[PDB]
Ligand binder design. Structure first.
Ligand SMILES: [Mg+2]
Ligand SMILES: [Mg+2]
Ligand SMILES: [Mg+2]
Ligand SMILES: [Mg+2]
Ligand SMILES: [Mg+2]
Ligand SMILES: [Mg+2]
Ligand SMILES: [Mg+2]
Ligand SMILES: [Mg+2]
Ligand SMILES: [Mg+2]
Ligand SMILES: [Mg+2]
Ligand SMILES: [Mg+2]
Lengths: 236, 130, 60, 140
RNA sequence: GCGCACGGCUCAGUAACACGUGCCUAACCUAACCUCGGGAGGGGGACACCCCCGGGAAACUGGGGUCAAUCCCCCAUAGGGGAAGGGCGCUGGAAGGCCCCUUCCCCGAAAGGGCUGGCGGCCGAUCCGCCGCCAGUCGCCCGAGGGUGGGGGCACGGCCCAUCAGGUAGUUGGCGGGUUAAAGGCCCGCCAAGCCGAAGACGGGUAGGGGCGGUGAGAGCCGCGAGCCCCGAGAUGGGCACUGAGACA
């Protein structure tokens, strides 16, 4: 599979004319192709540690880069929203957080925060033994007993412990919580969920966030609750 | 299978009755079909597992002797023997040539039964007593 | 040479039969003596197939 | 017909080739693959024990077309080969039309491959302890 | 084993769900990768290279011998499918779906394999291995979701001619089936006469569609709508298949 540079996603931090005709294609991993950046692109164009694809692939193949608590030795590994990126020989820890200008940026985060990931619940399924499988925004799954799975609804958020494989906390989608827009145009805006128009399709409901007097609107699919008035994890 | 001899692709005829040109010269393998594989009434059950699209498998009953006949008036399942086919309402040629299809009436040892399964697609004859 | 070579093949097949029976010590003895004979008389590569078969049999 | 018969000893792993001719030519003609002929016929060419029966394993024709055991009759045929006997596919699932010949020996055959049959319970010496070229290279 | 179905070319066919925009699949498949849960037990076989012989002009190819596997197969279990009945429960706008219970029939997994280090034992220089355990690591199988690719459907939009006015008969629809990964006159059996058309059918002509390009103050006109990117089709003409997740390459 190839990725022509013209068909590369528009938000990617690469030049559109100066360069080759190809771009590094993400390797079908734990995100969306159009909402993720390959690890080699992160190493070469986002952190500037490697000057070529060869040097970036060397750095990745040594195992110096860790994504969400797991060493990633594939240079095409997708990196997406809220992922924790950890550099081993340097000790620097970033979170892939929504950004107003670059649309997705690596912001440094504390080491205590590096083991948590805020994952937006994307759906629920019934699996064998009567258990509930929660599907999150990046394709991750969690199988839980039916009673705990009953009270978690779609579009909720869970702060999830990567190291324990557990749900550290659950943040339900209620009016007045703090939410961040993770998608289109109004990206990166943090504000209070204060207004909803419930369309017939729940994913397409109109949501309005407020930051003092700053009112932005999106659809319900494009927001993620990151807690009450103070965000649980450092996003900015 | 996926055979060009049993192509399931579009027609060349418009709804207005006129013809239209061929957008694609060759026949897609994805749009190919296969010949009928419904069982023939025989002396022993012969089953054949076939590879299909995407590497999945389909069990074909190339010859059928026994039927899983369900009596709802007893709430019981019995593995009966097919003496003959009484009728094939979809096409009488099936019963005439002793082929078993869905909706076919079969005279098994428990009585008359309607075939409630697709024997060419499921590989078994699930039947319901009448 | 043909008499020596044929006799060596006989001892090789008897060794493989004993190894198939399970008599690994007897088969090892026959293999060692036939190996010494082949090393002195230059029939190693000629008997290469049967030597490989008997070695695999005694490994098994 | 003149033949270049290969005879294979299944106990020594070796084979020997004899040019077969006038009296044995009609003996080899007419034989299907796998047929049984006693080893005493080759008395003038090879010294066999009186328990060995030579089986017809195969052959190759005047243009090199091998004898296909699955085809009957003494005929030349084109087959859409997908398997080993008469075709060695370089790609998985690749089928080819390959010229072959029938299981019956004809006069157009140039090579006949046959293998010894030692008697049941035999434990003697191999009929061919060494090949001719092997012995010649050993001696030099 | 994996890849070669991407990449490269070109513009015959095509006035079409081809293409563009906006939506679907609750009617579907998907190797590689991600995540969550679970599993990896017993047994067997063959074919290369190779050795001994070849045959044939070449292409190619025969017989015997012999060592292996993450090669091929059987067994067990897990799991899966079909028919029928029931249900708190799940998703979702909506269950023909998921999960649970019940019955029968049917199909039916796996490579603990490689490496590293440690331990122990068997074995022998004719050996430089084999076996049992542990940790690390790359792997293998099942279930669910994602990802990616693909198949299919829908509404609308973009040529000329009436010196082309009636066209259509599997044609239009229904019912029951077969096939398919999956809906569908896709195909088949029966039933009805329906369907399109002057808001231009049908017929002919021209043409790959789009982003876009030239020109003009602009409306607009033109396609130099060749080169660059996206989709389509094709590989001398016409057909049909193997393998495979995927080709009719
Ligand atoms: Mg291509
Ligand atoms: Mg395997
Ligand atoms: Mg199921
Ligand atoms: Mg099994
Ligand atoms: Mg094994
Ligand atoms: Mg159907
Ligand atoms: Mg039609
Ligand atoms: Mg002017
Ligand atoms: Mg060019
Ligand atoms: Mg052609
Ligand atoms: Mg071709």
């Amino acid at each position: 599979v190839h990725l022509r540079k013209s068909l590369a996603p528009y938000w990617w931090p690469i030049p559109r004319k100066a360069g080759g005709v190809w771009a590094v294609r993400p390797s079908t991993g734990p995100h969306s192709l159009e909402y993720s950046l390959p690890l080699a692109v992160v190493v070469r164009d986002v952190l500037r540690y490697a000057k070529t694809l060869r040097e970036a692939r060397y750095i990745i193949s040594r195992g110096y880069i860790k994504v969400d608590g797991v060493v990633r030795k594939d240079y095409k590994f997708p990196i997406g929203l809220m992922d924790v990126v950890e550099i081993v020989p340097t000790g620097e820890i970033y979170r892939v957080v929504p950004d107003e200008a670059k649309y997705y940026d690596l912001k440094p985060i504390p080491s205590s925060e590096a083991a948590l990931k805020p994952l937006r619940v994307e759906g629920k399924t019934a699996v064998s033994g009567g258990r509930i499988q929660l599907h999150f925004h990046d394709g991750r799954n969690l199988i839980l007993p039916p009673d705990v799975g009953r009270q978690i609804k779609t579009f909720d958020t869970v702060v999830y412990d990567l190291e324990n494989k557990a749900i550290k906390t659950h943040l339900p989608l209620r009016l007045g919580q703090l939410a961040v827009v993770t998608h289109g145009g109004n990206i990166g805006f943090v504000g209070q969920f204060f207004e909803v128009v419930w369309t017939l399709k729940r994913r397409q409901s109109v949501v309005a966030l407020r930051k003092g007097e700053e009112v932005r609107r999106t659809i319900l699919d494009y927001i993620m609750v990151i807690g009450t008035e103070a965000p649980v994890v450092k996003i900015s | 299978m996926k055979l060009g001899a049993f192509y399931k692709g579009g027609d060349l005829v418009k709804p207005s009755g006129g013809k239209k040109g061929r957008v694609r010269k060759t026949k897609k393998k994805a749009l190919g079909g296969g010949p009928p594989q419904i069982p023939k009434l025989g002396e022993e059950d012969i089953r054949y597992v076939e590879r299909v699209r995407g590497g999945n498998h389909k069990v074909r009953l190339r010859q059928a002797r026994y039927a899983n006949v369900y009596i709802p008036k007893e709430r019981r399942h019995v593995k009966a023997k097919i003496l003959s086919i009484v009728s094939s309402p979809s096409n009488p040629d099936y019963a005439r040539r002793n082929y078993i299809v869905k909706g076919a009436i079969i005279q098994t040892e428990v009585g008359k039964a309607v075939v409630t399964s697709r024997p060419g697609q499921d590989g078994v004859i699930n039947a319901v007593l009448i | 040479l043909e008499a020596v070579a044929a006799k060596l093949i006989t001892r090789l097949r008897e060794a493989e039969r004993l190894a198939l029976e399970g008599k690994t010590s007897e088969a090892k003895a026959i293999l060692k003596e036939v190996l010494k004979e082949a090393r002195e008389r230059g029939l190693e590569k000629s008997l290469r197939n049967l030597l490989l078969r008997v070695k695999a049999l005694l490994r098994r | 017909p003149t033949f270049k018969l290969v005879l294979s000893d299944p106990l020594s792993g070796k084979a020997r080739q004899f040019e077969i001719k006038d009296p044995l030519a009609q003996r080899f003609v007419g034989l299907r693959i796998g047929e049984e002929i006693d080893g005493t016929v080759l008395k003038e060419l090879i010294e066999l024990p009186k328990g060995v029966k030579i089986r017809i394993t195969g052959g190759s024709g005047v243009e090199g077309a091998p004898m296909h055991p699955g085809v009957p009759g003494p005929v030349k045929r084109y087959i859409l080969a997908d398997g080993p006997p008469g075709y060695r596919p370089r790609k998985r699932g690749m089928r080819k039309k390959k010229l072959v010949r029938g299981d019956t020996i004809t006069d157009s055959i140039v090579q006949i491959n046959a293998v010894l049959v030692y008697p049941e319970g035999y434990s003697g010496p191999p009929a061919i302890p060494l090949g001719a070229k092997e012995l010649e290279k050993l001696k030099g």
